[PDB]
């Protein structure tokens, strides 16, 4: 349990992502990371780090959450 790996974000995509391209998201909060972040999973399983504070990032989360 304590020796599990931790995934972190070292960069934030600077280009917004279409919601029709998103499949799911993860919340990164480990103090082991440089900072809290959001990881988007695209339709094709690609992972992308985004800034939790940007309006579109929050609007996406709200959408994926309200989704099925």
């Amino acid at each position, epitope marked *: *349990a304590i020796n599990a790996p931790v995934t972190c974000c070292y960069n934030f995509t600077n280009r917004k992502i279409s919601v029709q391209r998103l499949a799911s998201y993860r919340r990164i*909060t480990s*103090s082991k990371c440089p900072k809290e972040a959001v990881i988007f999973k695209t339709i094709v399983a690609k992972e992308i780090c985004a800034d939790p504070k940007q309006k579109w990032v929050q609007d996406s989360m709200d959408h994926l959450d309200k989704q099925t």
Partner: antibody
Amino acid sequence: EVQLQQSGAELVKAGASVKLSCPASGLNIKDTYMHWVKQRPEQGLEWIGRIDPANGNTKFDPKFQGKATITADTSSNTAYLQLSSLTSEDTAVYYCARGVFGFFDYWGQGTTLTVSS
Amino acid sequence: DIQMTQSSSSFSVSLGDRVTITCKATEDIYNRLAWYQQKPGSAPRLLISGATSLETGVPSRFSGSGSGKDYTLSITSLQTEDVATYYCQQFWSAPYTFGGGTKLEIKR
């Protein structure tokens, strides 16, 4: 690791104002949202507001507008909570916490505020 | 605002058995619920967020689940250190709000 320090205790006269401070270490408050939460034995936990130390924007629970002023300093990595024209209804325990998403994974030990004369 | 309420504000329990605390939201909150534990002299401690996500330093006997408007925290083989007050909190939309809390007491 992440750790938040708080003023600890405060004694202020009714009608006066007070400014509570919460210094952070182990993280940079720029990268997150700093919140303040009020707690009373009787009425429990209450979220007051948050501040984005990066741009200085705040969000408040209307119930605290004009009584609570949240401010921050990225240099000293400190968050502040100002309370104006205090009343006995204001005496309680005040916590500051981190939480870009809305829940709070890191808290300060809290600062007790007693409105007395 | 969204109002959070908990089944009861208190439960008398026994060391070792399973304990369940219930939370009910005023409206759907899409798993954006968090659970906290708080003992008499300190700040609340985050145990679970996202309704299911367990904070790292939290014992595996703690777990949560539910959806829409109904959520529950579950503690298996209750330990004495587990006796405290538990609060549910919603983070779907501001103003963020907590449940009134459920205090655990040991029966005798």
